[PDB]
Ligand binder design. Structure first.
Ligand SMILES: O=C(CSc1nc(-c2ccccc2)cc(=O)[nH]1)NO
Ligand SMILES: O=C(CSc1nc(-c2ccccc2)cc(=O)[nH]1)NO
Ligand SMILES: [Cl-]
Ligand SMILES: [Mn+2]
Ligand SMILES: [Zn+2]
Ligand SMILES: [Zn+2]
Length: 457
């Protein structure tokens, strides 16, 4: 009546045989999980990564959070040790409820969360940790490094397919051979939670998957929306919180918010829930919106994840970013061309899928180049876009990261537009412009052919 819990998302309990290969497993469950946006995976009783840390030596700078529904927040930004954070967090929860922390029912914390965020009178603030691994606070999974002898148990999980440090560099990940600067998306993030600390509604950068593991502690409660309903959710957000939709200055500056899932469900957005317990994975699918909050003191690790299934969606995402004038994290076309340049060592299923995306890329590029030639741009020169800092190769109009080609004018030194925005660079006549291109079409067809040969093996 006050809060009606969404239906439970799918929960999978794979055998060791089914579990061992994450890419195969996710591909298998996709017909089901893509309809719910999120799903939970319980590893075989077998699989038990060791979790060891000195809570007095781990330390981090906490972020602070007000809990008001529809209030604007941002995803990116005092010091706690893991022990002193834990002490603060446990005391907060047990004081809030006047109960021992584990005797508080998960259903109650959930009901209470949605009450407190909806109430103007309440001004509850909480703290949390969120960062990539560092020397001050490393991964929860085993990683290789000298000077430290690992135990046989730790050694066992160094090369696990579900060790999140590994997933982005495995052979069926399309980011594996990517050498570009995208620290954000190949490195796991670490999240230290406390009761009610919350992650607002969002999808992943470039519509990637995310894989999320709860190492230890009280559960993390999730809400998820399938990819096919992303635009309906956004329309609801626009109607109820239009303040979130003003133009952001940077990539690091887009706005997100807390919103009751019942509100979404009332507006015909399908929503699913789950409580993720210690030792369980949650997987979010491409363009699947999700949000949630922590039941209490806990420690989670998450990583973006890009598969062959994701490739066409990645291209659509960048297109969508362009229409919104939103910054990219990386160049999709650069990733594709990098993989083509390494066709001889690519996984063959990867090669096959990349070949298909590349064919779409080349036909789109060919049409765009014909169009800008008809606008009177005649001069051209090869340009190694990958050498430019990312903030030095965005289209001045739509902020897309250029790689295949761009237009420049010596009138505006250093400025670029993508080929969709030739008319947005300056007032000079087009014959003063140069087409800057990474590859000729003659360079591109043999690259695509290499992929095709590799895929035929
Ligand atoms: O949680 C599960 C996983 S297998 C499975 N789940 C579902 C499902 C579970 C929750 C929400 C929607 C679908 C549909 C189906 O055909 N199969 N079953 O109870
Ligand atoms: O969305 C996720 C991470 S869940 C999570 N995220 C956060 C978080 C993420 C970004 C910025 C701040 C917090 C905190 C937390 O306790 N949990 N994976 O797809
Ligand atoms: Cl509040
Ligand atoms: Mn996420
Ligand atoms: Zn543009
Ligand atoms: Zn000019």
């Amino acid at each position: 009546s006050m809060f009606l819990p969404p239906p439970e998302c799918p929960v999978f309990e794979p055998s060791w045989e089914e579990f061992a290969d994450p890419f195969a497993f996710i591909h298998k469950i996709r017909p089901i999980a893509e309809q719910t946006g999120i799903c939970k995976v319980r590893p075989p009783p077998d699989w038990q990564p060791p979790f060891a840390c000195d809570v007095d030596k781990l330390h981090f700078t906490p972020r602070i959070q007000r809990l008001n529904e529809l209030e604007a927040q941002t995803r990116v930004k005092r010091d706690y040790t893991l022990r002193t954070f834990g002490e603060m967090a446990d005391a907060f929860k047990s004081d809030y409820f006047n109960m021992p922390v584990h005797m508080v029912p998960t259903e109650l914390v959930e009901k209470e969360f949605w009450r407190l965020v909806s109430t103007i009178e309440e001004d509850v603030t909480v703290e949390y940790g969120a960062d990539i691994a560092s020397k001050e606070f490393g991964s929860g999974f085993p990683v290789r490094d000298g000077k430290i002898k690992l135990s046989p148990e730790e050694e066992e999980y160094l090369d696990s397919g579900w060790n999140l440090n590994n997933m982005p560099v495995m052979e069926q990940s399309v980011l594996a051979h990517i050498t570009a600067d995208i620290c954000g998306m190949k490195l796991p993030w670490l999240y230290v939670g406390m009761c009610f600390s919350s992650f607002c509604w969002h999808i992943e950068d470039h519509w990637s998957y995310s894989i999320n593991y709860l190492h230890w502690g009280e559960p993390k409660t999730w809400y998820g929306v399938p990819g096919y309903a992303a635009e309906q959710l956004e329309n609801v957000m626009k109607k109820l919180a239009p303040e979130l939709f003003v133009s952001q200055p940077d990539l690091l500056h887009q706005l997100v918010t807390i919103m009751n899932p019942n509100t979404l469900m009332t507006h015909e957005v399908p929503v699913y829930r789950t409580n993720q317990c210690a030792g369980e994975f949650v997987i979010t699918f491409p363009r699947a919106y999700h949000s949630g909050f922590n039941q209490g003191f806990n420690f989670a690790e998450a990583v973006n994840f890009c598969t062959v299934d994701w490739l066409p969606l990645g291209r659509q995402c960048v297109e969508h970013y362009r229409l919104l004038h939103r910054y990219c994290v990386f160049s999709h076309d650069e990733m594709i061309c990098k993989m083509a340049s390494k066709a001889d060592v690519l996984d063959v299923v990867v090669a096959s899928t990349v070949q298909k995306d590349m064919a779409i890329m080349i036909e789109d590029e060919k049409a765009l180049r014909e169009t800008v030639r008809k606008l009177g741009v005649i001069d051209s020169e090869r340009m190694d876009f990958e050498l430019l800092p990312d903030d030095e190769r965005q289209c001045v109009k739509c902020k897309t990261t250029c790689f295949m080609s761009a237009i420049s004018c010596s009138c505006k030194p250093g400025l670029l537009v993508c080929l969709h925005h030739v008319k947005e660079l300056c007032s000079c006549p087009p014959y003063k412009y140069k087409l800057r291109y990474r590859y000729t079409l003659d360079d591109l067809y043999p690259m695509m052919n290499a992929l095709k040969l590799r895929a035929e093996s």
